[PDB]
Amino acid sequence: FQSMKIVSAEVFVTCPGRNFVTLKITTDSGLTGLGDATLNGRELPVASYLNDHVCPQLIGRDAHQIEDIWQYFYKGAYWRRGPVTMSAISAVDMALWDIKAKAANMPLYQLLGGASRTGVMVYCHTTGHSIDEVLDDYAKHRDQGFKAIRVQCEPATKGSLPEEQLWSTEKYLDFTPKLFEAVRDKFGFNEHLLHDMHHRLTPIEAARFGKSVEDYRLFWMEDPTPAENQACFRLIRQHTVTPIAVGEVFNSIWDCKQLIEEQLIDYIRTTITHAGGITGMRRIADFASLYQVRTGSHGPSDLSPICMAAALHFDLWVPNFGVQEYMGYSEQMLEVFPHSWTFDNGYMHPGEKPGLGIEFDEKLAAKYPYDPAYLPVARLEDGTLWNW
Amino acid sequence: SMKIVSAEVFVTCPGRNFVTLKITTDSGLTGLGDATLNGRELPVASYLNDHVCPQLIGRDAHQIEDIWQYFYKGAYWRRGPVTMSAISAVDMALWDIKAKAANMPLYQLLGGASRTGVMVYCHTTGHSIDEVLDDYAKHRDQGFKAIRVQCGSLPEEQLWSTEKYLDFTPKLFEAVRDKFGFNEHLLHDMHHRLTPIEAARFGKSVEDYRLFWMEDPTPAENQACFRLIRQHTVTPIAVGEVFNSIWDCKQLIEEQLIDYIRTTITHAGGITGMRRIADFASLYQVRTGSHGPSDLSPICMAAALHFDLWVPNFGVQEYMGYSEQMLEVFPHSWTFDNGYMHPGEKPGLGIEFDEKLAAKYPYDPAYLPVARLEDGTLWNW
Amino acid sequence: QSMKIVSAEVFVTCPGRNFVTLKITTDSGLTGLGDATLNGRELPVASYLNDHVCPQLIGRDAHQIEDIWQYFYKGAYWRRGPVTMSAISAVDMALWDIKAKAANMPLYQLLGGASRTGVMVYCHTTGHSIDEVLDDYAKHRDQGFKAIRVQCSLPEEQLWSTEKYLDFTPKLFEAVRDKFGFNEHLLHDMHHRLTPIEAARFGKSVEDYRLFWMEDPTPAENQACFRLIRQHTVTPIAVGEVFNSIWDCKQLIEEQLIDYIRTTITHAGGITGMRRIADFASLYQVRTGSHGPSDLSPICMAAALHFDLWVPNFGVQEYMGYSEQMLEVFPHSWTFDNGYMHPGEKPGLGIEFDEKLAAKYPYDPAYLPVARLEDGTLWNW
Amino acid sequence: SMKIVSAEVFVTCPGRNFVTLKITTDSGLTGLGDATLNGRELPVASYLNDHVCPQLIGRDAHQIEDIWQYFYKGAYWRRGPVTMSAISAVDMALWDIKAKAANMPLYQLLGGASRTGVMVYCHTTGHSIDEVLDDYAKHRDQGFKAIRVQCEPATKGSLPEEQLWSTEKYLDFTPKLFEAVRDKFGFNEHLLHDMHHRLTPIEAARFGKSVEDYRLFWMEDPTPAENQACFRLIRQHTVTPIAVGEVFNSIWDCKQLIEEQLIDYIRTTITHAGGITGMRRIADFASLYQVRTGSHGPSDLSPICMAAALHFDLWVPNFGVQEYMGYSEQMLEVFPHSWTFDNGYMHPGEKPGLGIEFDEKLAAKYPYDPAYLPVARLEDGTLWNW
Amino acid sequence: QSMKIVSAEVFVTCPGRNFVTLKITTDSGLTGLGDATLNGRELPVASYLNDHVCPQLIGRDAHQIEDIWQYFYKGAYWRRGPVTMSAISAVDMALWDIKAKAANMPLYQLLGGASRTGVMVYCHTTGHSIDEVLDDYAKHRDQGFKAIRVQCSLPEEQLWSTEKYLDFTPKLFEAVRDKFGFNEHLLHDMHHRLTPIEAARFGKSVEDYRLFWMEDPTPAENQACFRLIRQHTVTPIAVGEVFNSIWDCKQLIEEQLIDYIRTTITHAGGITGMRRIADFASLYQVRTGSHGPSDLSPICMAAALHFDLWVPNFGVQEYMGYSEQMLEVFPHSWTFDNGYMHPGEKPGLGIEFDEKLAAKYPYDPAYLPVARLEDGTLWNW
């Protein structure tokens, strides 16, 4: 309210179905803020970054100074950005905005400039090992009122060893376009059809693929090629009108500045938890808007419901909103995070609970100890370690 | 939630012309915004009164973003000085309301303080070197850490000569540094008078005196015109007081042709727009240098100080200042001490408007001067 | 030899919709008219003229068109924008009216004389179904139109959906070309609704039907946004009704991203500004296709037809048409024969303004619609 | 095919914190790797201990490249300081092992010696011109051919020290310093200077112009480089050479700086920028543009990194210089070394592998002790770059 | 610890065609071989080694591979080129042979170890008609080949016609994909015959058949000549068999104009040079596809397979094959199983050179063909 100094900043590691890492900031006034810090397959280094280094440095600080605190840790780290660093910084930022919206006694989205929309369009996944199988999952999710659907013919598998998947580009190219003809043939052009390419193709391959699918008018093709070299998207963009989305693996505006300003992409999928929190995400979204690039935040189960809360708040205000991904959470996971958001015929809403409108049931959570789970790696026929 | 019950515009001339917007919610909350456009005040009065204000009535005062977008895109004819002065008034006033509603000084809503105080600069007047040196001492004595050094119904017409300016103006700075050393930041306004290669020369000619910035070197409708300056001098460059949009300066920033962006709350889209401008500028290590003359109302000054306190890439804040007469009309809460200002801690912007004191000053026309060269050529003032 | 301006007055009338007219009178009794209409923001321009520009016009030599344009363009300090430029254009238009009268010539003669024998215009087509559009198309063809554009209180809010537009609209053109063949020019307005890669797709999807142009594909404040469209389709692009300046379109043109520039006399700086725009466009083989809706007054249409008859790189002229009522307030002298118009041979613009009929209809507030997406996102209308 | 049986992480603080990785093959071959990330050590210990090390067990230690790729790409979340510090530890450790297997000092495996020694530079300091001049004198006497002039930064404690910064004062004073140094000692030694990320580009442009007469070997870290285009303004206004990259973890951090020829020295390191595998690719790329290596070498990189760097330095064609801030003897006891120093030049030695040891028993006498780099703030409290 | 070179000898033999081999021997008796073969210009390389490089190798520490490479690369003063680089590559190859032996490892181990389990190779197809090609294709498939390349005294002169090639060749691929489906990788060599817009057309004309690559579309001395191809087709491009340096392909790669770089150990600077080429290529997602004809000696193929097994960005390896006769002179240790090869686990390159069998076949002059167009214009073969 007046000057809320931080009395404690605590890290919680729990596995209610999968691993989540959580930060809790408490002020002297007793206000609490929650932040997700989950980094899938590499959760603990982030727990450490916070527990051992950042949290002790939060104590005594005026929680009102979100920006100074962000700068302090972003630059003060000396070694800048990266996934572990930014997961930490984001967790803090998220928690501080929670607190601030509470101090203000409003739902966060009000603080960002209010609602730009009445609801947040979300999209879901279809899983099947044949055309017929997918066609059904689609039918199913349609009926549940989803207006956007991701077609593909828990990723982080328990077991301290990453599972190794064989991959062939040639086959994927020849078949996948068939997958979409089918979905359009059967269901018409009524829902938004999304597709994730999982970083598997070289640029000229991703170019051919995009062309190969223009007839089916995808809402987007995602993560066409590894994007560490942002110029690699140029070849795709000059050869196809299939929209491009990328960015779930990005942790900073520096990862995507060139992709945006060269207009190489249509949707930016950076997330509150990995790309610098509310503070970072606002800057990314606003930058994107200059180039008519829209938001399409990554939303799998490996970002905690805390992140989902913050994302929905962000999504209701942000002018250049595109879509919000909504893989699900098991009931088991949701129980650990009492929420207050709503889902209604394809659209979500963060609700009107002050702050993020989210909770963390520590006692429940403290009953699921951390349990090692890792994302798969991909190799080619010949063993070449590839992009998963 | 709060519906807008009334949106009223006030024109007053407490020593100079000011146009003010007052928004009132069904809950009692009021928000103030500046709409002052020097020399073209009344077209903004009309833009609000006759057009925007009526369409504000009944709306949720919480939907700042939707409202900005509604009037920015909804106008169909986009941006411009009159349009953006109107949109910014509204925006400034809704953030006053939002932060009152949240019971916080605005800067708290922007992300909190990044600094303890806001460095400001003032103007030193003179008709000779010795006069300027005097006003300079006078201002350093008042605690200023930054000092800017310069030697009716019808606009005054002023005669301009570039060649004389080029030949003389550098001796002025030499004088100032000779007497006062290099302790204060030395700023200078070029008032759009030079072509790019002239500005290049000027910049080079003042490199020894390490200026904080040279401002408004050449008109910037063609943003590429700053390329020649930038490739020839390491004298820092500031620009933007006349801009009303990110679109006015995106190329200047992204090509790194400027060091300070001088856009303001009242003319460049309010808190909402200025945030986006400043954040974009930061990617390129461009800092804020907001324009702050007497022809932007204390209401703008209130918001600017709130903004300046949070904004990470803050550079400096201009403070021309106000007469006591002007201020009386705008009861204010900001503080000043030893060359630094602070917005204060009052909820909202921390500013008020004396509607009946204002009522005593009807609008009195005044116009910026135009410049002409020797041969009469209409030039840049 | 010297035509001092004795008066410059602003009239606002609503003979079926709103119009703002400027009247300049010299000491010799010569009068010139200028349109100042800005749809849905009419009164701020009224003010810009009435309160600020007009009194500064008094005493001036109406012969100095260029000096006046520059005086108000730069003298304003806050440069360009829709309200500013509507005012400056009103003046410029009326000053050329006066100059052509003083020369005892129709204005096109002052511009360099006729480059064509008549000005090809185009019209719109009403229809809520492929079937109803095909009817209006047939009708307009019978009226001799050689070029046809196909489309299927408080601001009305309209629900927009890009995906539907993408899927349906190509069928409308297949229809029209199936029934009517490739005899007329098929124009189409996209109304700023698509993102750039969306517009790229659209343009590609309509290549078979060989459109005269697709217009306003995407908001163009970021002029580079047109690059993605232009590299993906050979469907010609037209833009610019919402522009007030060469600065709004210089990149679009110099990067050869557009085929037609649609800026108008009333909004883009008058005859003086339009000339510079057209000439610049021509270097890059961009042709004119000026915006001509009902919300630009018959004074503009007269100004436009003179401009159109002369300008070498002429492409086409829009003609939404006027109601018998509106036309009344503006006695006119142009002609229309078999798809082609002509300004006539009367001195000046060849246009009148019936002030007493005008004073019969008072200003009546009317505002353009806004667009929203399904989720309520404020969009481009 | 010598499989990995253990991959152990140690955290010791013999004067300051180090993190060390030890890999052991089934044949008993061991490899050491540095993983120290100053002020953020423990997330790297965890990245290894908790995630990477268990996934190394049973793999063939010969497959340096598959392993590099496996963790680089396999992480899904690519690069960054913690990630690359972990990956680098394992890489230089695998190269240690490979050179041992080859029964050769590592430089031989990289392509052999390109020079007879490795020119290093030391730090000079003082709070007055006169004092710096003194320290300079000393270092020339010790035989340093290159000297860094300015006028243990990570301070033990809970909270980062906060330092007041003024750019204006720095611009006006600092050239006088170099003048004095040149006036007194002539132009016989290479004169270096670190700018510590403090300046904006146009400011750095001016500074660089302002010191041209003193012909600096380089001016380092002029302005934050997250936006690499920020170096264009500097490079077009001054002929003072530019070094940067101690804070980089990847080729992606510097590829634009190098290919637009905005820098003369790349300062990436074995521990932070991807190990031997990563640094080779970085050095080779830079050579195309006539950019040379200027490896960062403070005390906060372990003597294991120094051993690897000297091996790398002896081979790499485009070698520029090697920083050698130095190690207290307490530090060195824990890492029994075999490199040599002789008149401003160093040499990795001829011991197989890296030629470096880690005395686990001694390391165990010194437990992790929190210490953090300072932050900078301006007069008004603005959080700046330190 | 120190391996002085005691001897470095050059052998020229024609066991079915010409080969030039270099043998380096150390004071410890370790020997390393290197290929120096340059097809049709074999003897100038023999000389470069024999007369100039080899005596300068004597007395030197064979451990200093990098210093030696640099000494001859820059020391030559006249830098790179086919003859120069064949010589430098011969040396480099043989020096790494020696180093891996001294390390008692197969060389791939020195490079960073295996990145794959085997090296995918591809083969050619003989046929004077669509029908005969389809047969050889079937054959090679049965041999387990996973990737197949389809083609239909004094230098022999060959008549070339681009227009015919353009019209026919797409049918060859339709055939192959009609009969055999999309199971194998279809490669194709264009042999430098087309201009860039011709190659653009060709690539487009074959998109349906999804080639693994089209190779050598146009002479590439002007690397920008590849831009027109790359903007017009998504058919992957391979190039580089004729390159001797990174300088020959740096632009092709950095502008992302190619998908495979085909430089070889023997011609492009040895292991040392190829490593730098591959690593550079990888930044841009360019993969290796090294040229492997009979005119590169089994020493090269052994060098290549080691390189291929390690290099992360491996794409494919050509294997024209060797005659039982040639293979004789070069006892080898690599394997080939089911479309994939492997260098083996022998220390060094794993290759021998039967000197006494070699001295049985003397040099026999053989020269590549030249191409001429109809009118006799000397063209690219």
Ligand SMILES: [Cl-]
């Ligand atoms: Cl990281």
Ligand SMILES: [Cl-]
């Ligand atoms: Cl305006």
Ligand SMILES: [Cl-]
């Ligand atoms: Cl040669």
Ligand SMILES: [Mg+2]
């Ligand atoms: Mg994905």
Ligand SMILES: [Mg+2]
């Ligand atoms: Mg100024």
Ligand SMILES: [Mg+2]
């Ligand atoms: Mg239109």
Ligand SMILES: [Mg+2]
């Ligand atoms: Mg440094």
Ligand SMILES: [Mg+2]
């Ligand atoms: Mg070939």
